[PDB]
Design a protein around this ligand. Structure first.
Ligand SMILES: [Ca+2]
Ligand SMILES: [Ca+2]
Ligand SMILES: [Ca+2]
Ligand SMILES: [Zn+2]
Ligand SMILES: [Zn+2]
Lengths: 175, 161
């Protein structure tokens, strides 16, 4: 399994659900489908009010094939989960944006809560691997953090949103 | 508790499939080099097959794809592989919704392949950011001076010695 985990704003915009939750049990493996599921208590929801509260998160049963394995033993630690809705079930991979709420920056919590959704419709955080990167559009913000863990630990990831300054134009801004 | 490793030391591989982002040739070199990083530190050996079923089947796919775990378009998951075994096991899948490149300008086919072959030989992810078996893609390797990490050699040599 090989990941380029997304910028938080991207994670917000492209996930079907965005919530705070606690991890309550051990996953159950379900070998008919190929997926294991965790039971979770949701504590807050930021994106996804066009559904049904949710009690489970699903993910690939093997690490090799991008299964999320939950390292923390918690049991009260709130985590931010950003995942897609497959057939009415919350799905994540090890590439998803999943992180302890407390470990996020202020600019990351503001933003998950309010700021990010401003940039979803009109703006795009485009991942820059090697510089030079090509800028494909004026509404693209180049993500240039080249931390190995850019998503968790990068400056732009931890402080900046990709917001419109005017039509046709987006730039990195500070929250 | 189950530690997967191939029970033979001679394996086979087949590139069943080709991405358009590269010549049908650079693709071969990529895979070749990625098999080679693991063969150089172990007793493992690799024969190539051009027809039939190999131990390690290498393919490019998009979205719905043909197993339990669909790809997701550009970004996030780039590839995945299965631990040693018969069938789908041993195989490595690459999301062709990335731009696969010889160098660093895109997603480097060699780098990702080397990691995924690691899975085909029975390696799990490394918590070490220096390792190839770290699950984030090392976007900044220059490739010129790429070497196999010590955590990685210990891993593959604990399996095949
Ligand atoms: Ca196989
Ligand atoms: Ca992908
Ligand atoms: Ca492609
Ligand atoms: Zn992996
Ligand atoms: Zn697959």
């Amino acid at each position: 399994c090989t990941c380029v985990p997304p910028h938080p704003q991207t994670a917000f915009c492209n996930s079907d659900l965005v919530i705070r939750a606690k991890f309550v049990g051990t996953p159950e493996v379900n070998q008919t489908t190929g997926y294991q599921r965790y039971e979770i208590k949701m504590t807050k929801m930021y994106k996804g009010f066009q559904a049904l509260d949710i009690r489970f998160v699903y993910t690939p049963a093997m690490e090799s094939v991008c299964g999320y394995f939950h390292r923390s033993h918690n049991r009260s630690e709130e985590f931010l989960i950003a995942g897609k809705l497959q057939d009415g079930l919350l799905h994540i991979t090890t590439c998803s944006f999943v992180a302890p709420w407390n470990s996020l920056s202020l600019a990351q919590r503001r933003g998950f809560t309010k700021t990010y959704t401003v940039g979803c419709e009109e703006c795009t955080v485009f991942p820059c691997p090697s510089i030079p990167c090509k800028l494909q559009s004026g509404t693209h913000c180049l993500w240039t953090d080249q931390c190995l863990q850019a998503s968790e630990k990068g400056f732009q990831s931890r402080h900046l949103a990709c917001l419109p300054r005017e039509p046709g134009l987006c730039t990195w801004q500070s929250l | 508790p189950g530690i997967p490793k191939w029970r033979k030391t001679h394996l086979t591989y087949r590139i069943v499939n080709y991405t358009p982002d590269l010549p049908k040739d650079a693709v071969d070199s990529a895979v070749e080099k990625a098999l080679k990083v693991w063969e150089e530190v172990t007793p493992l050996t690799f024969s190539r097959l051009y027809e039939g079923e190999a131990d390690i089947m290498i393919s490019f796919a998009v979205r719905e794809h043909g197993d339990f775990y669909p790809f997701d378009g550009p970004g996030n998951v780039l590839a995945h592989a299965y631990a040693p075994g018969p069938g789908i096991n041993g195989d490595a899948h690459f999301d062709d919704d990335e731009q696969w490149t010889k160098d660093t300008t895109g997603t480097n086919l060699f780098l990702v392949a080397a990691h995924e072959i690691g899975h085909s030989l029975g390696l799990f992810h490394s918590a070490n950011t220096e390792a190839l078996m770290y699950p984030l893609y090392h976007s900044l390797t220059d490739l010129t001076r790429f070497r196999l990490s010590q955590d990685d050699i210990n891993g593959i040599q604990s399996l095949y010695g």
